[PDB]
Write an enzyme that holds these catalytic residues in place. Sequence first.
Site, short mmCIF file in Angstrom:
data_model
loop_
_atom_site.label_atom_id
_atom_site.label_comp_id
_atom_site.label_asym_id
_atom_site.label_seq_id
_atom_site.Cartn_x
_atom_site.Cartn_y
_atom_site.Cartn_z
N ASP A 1 -85.86 27.46 53.35
CA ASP A 1 -86.53 28.89 52.94
C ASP A 1 -85.41 30.03 53.09
O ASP A 1 -84.93 30.13 54.04
CB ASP A 1 -87.67 28.89 53.99
CG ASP A 1 -88.49 30.34 53.39
OD1 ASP A 1 -89.64 30.08 53.23
OD2 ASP A 1 -88.02 31.47 53.48
N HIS B 1 -97.87 35.61 51.10
CA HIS B 1 -97.96 36.95 51.48
C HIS B 1 -97.67 38.06 50.54
O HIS B 1 -96.72 37.85 49.67
CB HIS B 1 -97.62 37.10 52.91
CG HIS B 1 -96.02 37.00 53.16
ND1 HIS B 1 -95.14 38.03 52.96
CD2 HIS B 1 -95.35 35.82 53.43
CE1 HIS B 1 -94.11 37.76 53.18
NE2 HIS B 1 -93.98 36.19 53.35
N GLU C 1 -91.84 28.05 47.69
CA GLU C 1 -92.06 29.57 47.74
C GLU C 1 -91.45 30.14 46.68
O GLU C 1 -90.10 30.13 46.55
CB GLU C 1 -92.00 30.14 49.06
CG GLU C 1 -91.79 31.57 49.15
CD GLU C 1 -91.02 31.78 50.98
OE1 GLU C 1 -89.86 31.28 50.88
OE2 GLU C 1 -91.88 32.32 51.18
N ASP D 1 -88.05 36.16 48.72
CA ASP D 1 -88.21 34.69 49.59
C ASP D 1 -88.57 33.79 48.56
O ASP D 1 -89.65 33.75 47.82
CB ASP D 1 -89.54 34.90 50.30
CG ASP D 1 -89.46 34.16 51.77
OD1 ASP D 1 -88.45 33.50 51.78
OD2 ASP D 1 -90.23 34.26 52.50
N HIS E 1 -94.38 40.02 56.10
CA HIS E 1 -95.74 39.83 55.89
C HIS E 1 -96.56 41.17 55.78
O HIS E 1 -97.50 41.49 56.76
CB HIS E 1 -96.52 38.97 56.86
CG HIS E 1 -97.09 37.78 56.20
ND1 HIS E 1 -96.97 36.62 56.36
CD2 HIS E 1 -98.65 38.07 55.60
CE1 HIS E 1 -97.74 36.09 55.68
NE2 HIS E 1 -98.91 36.82 55.47
N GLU F 1 -96.35 31.08 48.94
CA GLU F 1 -95.83 30.17 49.83
C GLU F 1 -96.66 28.89 50.05
O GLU F 1 -97.68 28.78 50.71
CB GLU F 1 -95.50 30.52 51.16
CG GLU F 1 -94.70 31.73 51.44
CD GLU F 1 -94.58 32.14 52.95
OE1 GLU F 1 -95.55 32.59 53.31
OE2 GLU F 1 -93.49 32.64 53.46
#
Length: 295
Positions: free
Chosen positions: A82, A153, A280, A93, A161, A187
Site C-alpha cells: 500500500d 475513506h 485501493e 493512496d 482518514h 480500499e
Amino acid sequence: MDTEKLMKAGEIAKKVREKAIKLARPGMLLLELAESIEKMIMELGGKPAFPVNLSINEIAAHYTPYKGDTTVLKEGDYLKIDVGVHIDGFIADTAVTVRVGMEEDELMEAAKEALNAAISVARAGVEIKELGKAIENEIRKRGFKPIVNLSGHKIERYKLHAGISIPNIYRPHDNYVLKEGDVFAIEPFATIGAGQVIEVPPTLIYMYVRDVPVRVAQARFLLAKIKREYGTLPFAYRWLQNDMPEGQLKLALKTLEKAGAIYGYPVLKEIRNGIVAQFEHTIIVEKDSVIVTTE
C-alpha cells in the site's frame, strides 16, 4: 482546488506502485523491500503520507517494518503493498494485493473487480452506499468475505482518514452525496475468514495528535521533533530507530503515547487468519465521471 498537482501525487504513487510491485519476490526481506520503495518515492521528491504497508496473508494493514525485522516473502505469500504519498497536503493512496511469485488468484480478481465496480458506479451525486453495495456483490459474486470495519475513506488536504468511510458494504445509512471535489480512496478488502479484522500487537506506526506539555525530558523533545518533521501524517518505529538508544526511545514516545500526544495504530489481523485481499485507488468525483489519480 489543485487536483492537478494532487494527481501527480498519484502518478508518482503509481510509479512507485508499479516498481514496488516487481520486487515482491521471495528473498525480498520486507525491510529492505519497503525502504527500497520508500526512498524510491523520495526519488521523485514525492512526500510520503504514511509508511509503506506490507500487511500480508491474514494481517489486514498497519505493518511497515522496523530495522531488526527480516521476513523475506515466501512464494504465494499474499502480500499487500500500500503506497501513500502526497505533496504538501495533496495526498494519494493506492494498494495492491500481490500473490508473491505467483498468479492473480480468484481472491485477487474479486478485490480488484470491487474497485472497478465502485468506479464504474462512481459519479458525483451518488449515495455512498451504492458504491458500498456494488462492492459486496462483487465479493459475494466470487463468493468471498469482505471486511466489515476496514473500509475506504474520504481524504482531505493533509488528512488521511479525513472522513466518510466508503464501506465494503451497502450500509443503508451511507446516504451521503459524492460531489465535485469530494475525493476518496476506495480500499476494498476481502478474505474468507468471517469478515472482521482486529487490533494486534505490536504497533510500529504512531502519529501526533495533540500537544500535552510533557514532563519527561527528551519526550518533549521527541514530540517536538516529531511535530517538526512529521506533523499530522503517520510514521514508524523504523522512522525514529536511527535517533537514540533503542529502548530509551520506544519508551519515550510510549510515555508520549499515554500522555496523549500521539496515537499508535497496532496491526489488524483478519480476525480468523482469512487471506487479507486488499486493493485501493483514490479518485475524485466530478459529475458523470471521476478520476483515478492512481490509474
